[PDB]
Each structure stands twice: as C-alpha cells, then as structure tokens.
PDB file of C-alpha atoms (C1' of nucleotides) in Angstrom:
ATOM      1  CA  UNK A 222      -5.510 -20.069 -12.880  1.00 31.79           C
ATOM      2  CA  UNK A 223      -3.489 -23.254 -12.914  1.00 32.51           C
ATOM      3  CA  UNK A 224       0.022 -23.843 -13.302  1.00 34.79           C
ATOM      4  CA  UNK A 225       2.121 -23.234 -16.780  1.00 36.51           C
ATOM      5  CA  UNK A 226       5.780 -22.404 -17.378  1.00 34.22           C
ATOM      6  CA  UNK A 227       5.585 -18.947 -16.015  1.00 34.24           C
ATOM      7  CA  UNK A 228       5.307 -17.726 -12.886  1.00 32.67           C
ATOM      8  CA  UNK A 229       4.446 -13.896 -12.172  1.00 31.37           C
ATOM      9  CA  UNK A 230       6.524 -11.962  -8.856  1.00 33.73           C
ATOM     10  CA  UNK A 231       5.342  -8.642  -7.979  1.00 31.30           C
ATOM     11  CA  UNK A 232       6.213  -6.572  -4.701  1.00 32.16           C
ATOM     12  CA  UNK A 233       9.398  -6.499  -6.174  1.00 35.51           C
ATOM     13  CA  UNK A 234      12.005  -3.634  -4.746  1.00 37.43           C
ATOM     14  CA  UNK A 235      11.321  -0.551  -7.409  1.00 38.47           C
ATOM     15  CA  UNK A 236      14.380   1.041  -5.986  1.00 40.64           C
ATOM     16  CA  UNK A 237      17.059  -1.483  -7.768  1.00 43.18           C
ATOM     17  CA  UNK A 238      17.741  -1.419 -10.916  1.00 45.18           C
ATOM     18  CA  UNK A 239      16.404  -3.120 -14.053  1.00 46.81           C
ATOM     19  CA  UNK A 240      19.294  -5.410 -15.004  1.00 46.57           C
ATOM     20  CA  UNK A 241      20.463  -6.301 -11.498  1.00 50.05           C
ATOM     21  CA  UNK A 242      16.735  -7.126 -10.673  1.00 49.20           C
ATOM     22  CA  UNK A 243      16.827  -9.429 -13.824  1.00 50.57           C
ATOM     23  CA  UNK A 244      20.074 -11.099 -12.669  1.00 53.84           C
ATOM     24  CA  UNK A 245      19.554 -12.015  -9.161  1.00 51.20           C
ATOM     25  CA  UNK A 246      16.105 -13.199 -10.280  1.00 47.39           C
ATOM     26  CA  UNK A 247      17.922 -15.991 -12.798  1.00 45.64           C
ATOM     27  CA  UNK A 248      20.474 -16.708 -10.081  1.00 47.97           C
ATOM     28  CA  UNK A 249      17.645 -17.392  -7.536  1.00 46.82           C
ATOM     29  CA  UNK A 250      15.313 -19.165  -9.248  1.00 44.76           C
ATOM     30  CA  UNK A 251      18.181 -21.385 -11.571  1.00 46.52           C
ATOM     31  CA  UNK A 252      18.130 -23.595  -9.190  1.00 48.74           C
ATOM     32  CA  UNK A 253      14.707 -24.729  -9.803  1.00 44.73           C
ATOM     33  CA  UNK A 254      15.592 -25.425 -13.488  1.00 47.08           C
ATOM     34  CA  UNK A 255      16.582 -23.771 -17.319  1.00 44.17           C
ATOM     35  CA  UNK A 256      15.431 -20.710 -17.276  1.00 39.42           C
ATOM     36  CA  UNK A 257      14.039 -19.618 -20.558  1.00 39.10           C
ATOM     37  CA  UNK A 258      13.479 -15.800 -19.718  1.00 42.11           C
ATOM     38  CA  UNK A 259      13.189 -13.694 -17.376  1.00 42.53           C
ATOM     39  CA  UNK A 260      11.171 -10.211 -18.346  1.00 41.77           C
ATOM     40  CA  UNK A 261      10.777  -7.129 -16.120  1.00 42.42           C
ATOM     41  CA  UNK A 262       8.176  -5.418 -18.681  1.00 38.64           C
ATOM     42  CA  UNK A 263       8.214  -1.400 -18.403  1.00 37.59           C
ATOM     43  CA  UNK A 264       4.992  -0.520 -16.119  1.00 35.22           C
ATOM     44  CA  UNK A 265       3.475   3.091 -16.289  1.00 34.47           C
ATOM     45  CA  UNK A 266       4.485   3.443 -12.701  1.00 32.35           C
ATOM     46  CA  UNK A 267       7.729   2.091 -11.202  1.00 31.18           C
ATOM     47  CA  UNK A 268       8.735  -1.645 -11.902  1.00 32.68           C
ATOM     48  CA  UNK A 269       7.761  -3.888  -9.335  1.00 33.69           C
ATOM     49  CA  UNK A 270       7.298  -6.964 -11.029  1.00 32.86           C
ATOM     50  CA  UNK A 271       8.767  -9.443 -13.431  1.00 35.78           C
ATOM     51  CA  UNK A 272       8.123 -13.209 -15.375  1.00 36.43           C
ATOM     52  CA  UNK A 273      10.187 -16.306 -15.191  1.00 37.75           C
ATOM     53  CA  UNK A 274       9.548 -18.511 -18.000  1.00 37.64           C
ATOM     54  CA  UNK A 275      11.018 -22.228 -16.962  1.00 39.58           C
ATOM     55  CA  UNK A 276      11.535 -24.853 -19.717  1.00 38.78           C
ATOM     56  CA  UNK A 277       9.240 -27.237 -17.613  1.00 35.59           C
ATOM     57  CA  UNK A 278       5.879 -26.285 -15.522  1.00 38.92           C
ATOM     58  CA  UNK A 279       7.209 -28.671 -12.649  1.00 38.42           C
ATOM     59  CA  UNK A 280      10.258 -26.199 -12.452  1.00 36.97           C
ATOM     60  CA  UNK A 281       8.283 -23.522 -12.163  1.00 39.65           C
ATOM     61  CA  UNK A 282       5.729 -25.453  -9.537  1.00 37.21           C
ATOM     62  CA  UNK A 283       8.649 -25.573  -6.872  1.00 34.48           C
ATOM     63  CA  UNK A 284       9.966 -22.727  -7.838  1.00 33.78           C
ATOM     64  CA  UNK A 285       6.372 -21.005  -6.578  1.00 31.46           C
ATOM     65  CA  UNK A 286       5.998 -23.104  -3.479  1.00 31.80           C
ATOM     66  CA  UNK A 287       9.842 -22.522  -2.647  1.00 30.47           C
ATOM     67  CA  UNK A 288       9.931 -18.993  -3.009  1.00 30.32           C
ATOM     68  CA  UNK A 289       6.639 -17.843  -2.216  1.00 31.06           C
ATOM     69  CA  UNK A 290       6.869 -14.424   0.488  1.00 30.63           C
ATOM     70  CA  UNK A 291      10.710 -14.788   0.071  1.00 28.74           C
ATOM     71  CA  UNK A 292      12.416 -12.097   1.264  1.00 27.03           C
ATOM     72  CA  UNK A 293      14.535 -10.453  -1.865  1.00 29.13           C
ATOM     73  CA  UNK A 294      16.207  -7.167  -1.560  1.00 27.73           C
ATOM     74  CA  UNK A 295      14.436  -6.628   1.534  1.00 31.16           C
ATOM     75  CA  UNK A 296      11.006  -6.943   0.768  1.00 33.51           C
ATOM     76  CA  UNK A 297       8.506 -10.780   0.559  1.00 30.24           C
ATOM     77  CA  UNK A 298       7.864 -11.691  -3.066  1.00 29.53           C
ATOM     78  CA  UNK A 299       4.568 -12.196  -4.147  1.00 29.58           C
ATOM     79  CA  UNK A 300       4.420 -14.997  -6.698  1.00 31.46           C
ATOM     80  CA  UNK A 301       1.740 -16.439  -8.842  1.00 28.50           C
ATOM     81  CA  UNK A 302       1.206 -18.174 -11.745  1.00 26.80           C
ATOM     82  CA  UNK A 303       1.084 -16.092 -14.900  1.00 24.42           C
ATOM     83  CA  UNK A 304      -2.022 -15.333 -15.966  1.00 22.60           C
ATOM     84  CA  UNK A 305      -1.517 -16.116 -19.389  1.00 23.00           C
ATOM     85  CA  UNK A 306       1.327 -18.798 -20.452  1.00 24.41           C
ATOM     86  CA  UNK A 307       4.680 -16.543 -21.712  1.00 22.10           C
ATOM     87  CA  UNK A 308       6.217 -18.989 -23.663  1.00 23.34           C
ATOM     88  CA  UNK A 309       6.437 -18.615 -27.650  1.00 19.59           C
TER      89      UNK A 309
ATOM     90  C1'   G B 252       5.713  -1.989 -37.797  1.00 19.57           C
ATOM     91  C1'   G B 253       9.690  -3.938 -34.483  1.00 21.55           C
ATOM     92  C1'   A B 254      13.058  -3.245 -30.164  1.00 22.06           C
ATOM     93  C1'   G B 255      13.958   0.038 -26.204  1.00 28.23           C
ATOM     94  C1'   A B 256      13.372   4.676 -22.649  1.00 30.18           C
ATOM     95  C1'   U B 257       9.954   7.599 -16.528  1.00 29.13           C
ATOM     96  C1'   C B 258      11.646   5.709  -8.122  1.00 32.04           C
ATOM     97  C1'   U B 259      15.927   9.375 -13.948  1.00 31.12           C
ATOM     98  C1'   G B 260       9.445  11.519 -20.199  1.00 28.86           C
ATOM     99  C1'   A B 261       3.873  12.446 -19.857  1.00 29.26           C
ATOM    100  C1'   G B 262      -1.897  12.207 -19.773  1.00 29.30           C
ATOM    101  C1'   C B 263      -5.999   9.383 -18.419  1.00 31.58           C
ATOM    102  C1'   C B 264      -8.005   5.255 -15.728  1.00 29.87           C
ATOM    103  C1'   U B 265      -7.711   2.643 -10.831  1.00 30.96           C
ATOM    104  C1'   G B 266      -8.434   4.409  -5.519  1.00 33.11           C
ATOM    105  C1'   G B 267      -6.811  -2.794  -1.950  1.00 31.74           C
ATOM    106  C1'   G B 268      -2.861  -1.428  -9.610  1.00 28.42           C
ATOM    107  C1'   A B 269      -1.162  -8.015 -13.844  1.00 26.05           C
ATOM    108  C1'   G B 270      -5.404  -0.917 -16.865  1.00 21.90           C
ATOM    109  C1'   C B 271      -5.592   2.414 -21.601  1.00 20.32           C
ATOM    110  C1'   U B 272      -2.806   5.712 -24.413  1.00 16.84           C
ATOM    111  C1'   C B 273       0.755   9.247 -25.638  1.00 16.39           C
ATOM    112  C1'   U B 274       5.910  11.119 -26.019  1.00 15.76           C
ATOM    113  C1'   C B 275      11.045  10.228 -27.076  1.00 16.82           C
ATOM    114  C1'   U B 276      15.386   7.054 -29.033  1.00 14.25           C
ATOM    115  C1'   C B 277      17.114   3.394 -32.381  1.00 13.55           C
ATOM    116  C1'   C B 278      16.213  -0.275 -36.559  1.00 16.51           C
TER     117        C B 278
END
RNA sequence: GGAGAUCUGAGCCUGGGAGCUCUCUCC
C-alpha cells in the first residue's frame, strides 16, 4: 500500500455511537486539513472502524503519522492507509 | 436499483476479521 487521500482507523470504541464517532473523528483529524468525508460503513459485527477522505494525500500523511495508536474514547487507534483510494 | 437499519435484525465464512449474503425501512 502507499499513501492516497484516505486513511483507514479501526480499533475504534464499538460502544459509542455512530454519529458522535463521526463527529469527534472530523474534529480530530480537521486539523490536518479539509476533510472531504468521513464514513463509518455498517460492518456485520459491531462498528469499529471508519475512513477519512482528506482533499490532499499530504493531509492525510500527517494525519497518519500524528495520530497513529492515539488514544480516542479510551482505546489506541489503529490507522492505515486505505486500501483502495475513497475519493469519487 | 439507490440511500439507510443489528454492542438495539439474521445466516454463513473467518478462528490473529478491511469476508459473502440475507432481512427490514424509505425513495
């Protein structure tokens, strides 16, 4: 994998909910830059995980190194670069 | 077809989880 405009956090806390998840994500990772989207898709089991999609790839390269085992409610995110790129 | 819904719908797969499918709701 190398780096694109998304970045991929599992290990998430499945105990909060959807929306909040989705909203402290965008007003931790702003910072970094514009945020396009953030997704928290619907997994089979609990959600744990979630996609930032930054405007720029070097927003979302500090973003990874920056936040990388950060704790967030309670538990160290596990970030990555997504797989395949999420922007349309 | 599209958009949503399970720690608060389900089966299978996996067995160190970025898996497959169903069901329901709305358009």
């Amino acid at each position: 994998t190398r780096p694109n405009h998304t970045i991929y956090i599992n290990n998430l806390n499945s105990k909060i909910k959807k929306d909040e998840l989705k909203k402290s994500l965008h007003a931790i990772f702003s910072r970094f830059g514009q945020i396009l989207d953030i997704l928290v898709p619907r997994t089979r089991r609990p959600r744990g995980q979630a996609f930032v999609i930054f405007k720029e790839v070097s927003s979302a390269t500090n973003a990874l190194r920056s936040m990388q085992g950060f704790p967030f409610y309670d538990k160290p995110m596990a970030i990555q670069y997504a797989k395949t790129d999420r922007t349309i």
